[PDB]
């Protein structure tokens, strides 16, 4: 197609332009090769403090705000990535906020699985690597935050998607027509179908062997929505039980009356 094949590469560009790191880079850092200098691994409090002294309260709470700084940076990138979507800037100023209110984290987790593996994930622009077992070590409720994401990322990574696939997937996550409070539920739905259409045609052409990759990703979308709901629940517990853990203004604004 003309537009369908073109719009797919436009969203791809906005992905690469606004999103670093991506998956192609995360796969380079991992699996060795073309690198030779592996990232500093963080598997205990010792390695954690070494990585902290080189960056400028409890350990669990410090790791907290470190992930908040990344969530905030990602949401910003998402806002820029969203504006480059055909039709997002044309929507109502309030409908743009809602699409990003329920979609940001649902996308953050999708993209997060690119820098993850059964053993850990890459942090600090790929220069570091934090092991999964170390996170399960921390005290509750912190030890339960990242664990569900690893599980999703494992089954998600099984689908063997690349940045072109993921880009369209993320865009679809943002152009969700059944978000609570959506005004023009009719215009967004049309925009959503256009995005979902290209995604479907793109997968049928980029993975001709996996003929059901499209419905699987749909399943994953439902999984991510559930995965955000539970995450938002665990965030409230941390906001109300941990006295030294303060949410970021931008982050507190998004969870405000979410689920």
């Amino acid at each position: 197609t003309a537009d369908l094949k073109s719009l797919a590469k436009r969203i791809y560009e906005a992905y690469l332009k606004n999103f670093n790191m991506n998956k192609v880079k995360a796969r380079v850092i991992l699996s060795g090769k073309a690198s030779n200098n592996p990232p500093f691994v963080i598997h205990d409090m010792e390695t954690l403090c070494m990585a902290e002294k080189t960056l400028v309260k409890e350990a669990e709470v410090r790791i907290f705000h470190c992930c908040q700084c990344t969530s905030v940076e990602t949401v910003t990138e998402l806002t820029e990535f969203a504006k480059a979507i055909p039709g997002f800037a044309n929507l109502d100023l309030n409908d743009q906020v809602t699409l990003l209110k329920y979609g940001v984290y649902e996308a953050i987790f999708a993209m997060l699985s690119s820098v993850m593996n059964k053993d850990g994930m890459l942090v600090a622009y790929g220069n570091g690597f934090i092991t999964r077992e170390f996170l399960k070590s921390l005290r509750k409720p912190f030890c339960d935050i990242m664990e569900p994401k690893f599980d999703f990322a494992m089954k998600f990574n099984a689908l063997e998607l690349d940045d072109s696939d993921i880009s369209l997937f993320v865009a679809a996550i943002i152009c969700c027509g059944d978000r609570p409070g959506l005004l023009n539920v009719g215009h967004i739905e049309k925009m959503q179908e256009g995005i979902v259409h290209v995604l479907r045609l793109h997968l049928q052409s980029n993975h001709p062997d996996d003929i059901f990759l499209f419905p699987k990703l749909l399943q994953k979308m439902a999984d991510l929505r559930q995965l955000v709901t539970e995450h938002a629940q665990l965030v409230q517990i941390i906001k109300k039980t941990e006295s030294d853990a303060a949410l970021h203004p931008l982050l507190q604004e998004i969870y405000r009356d979410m689920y």
Binding site: L93, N94, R256
Partner: peptide, 10 residues
């Protein structure tokens, strides 16, 4: 809210 919309207006 106040942020986000402060961003969308860019």
């Amino acid at each position: 809210h106040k942020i986000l919309h402060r961003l969308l207006q860019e």
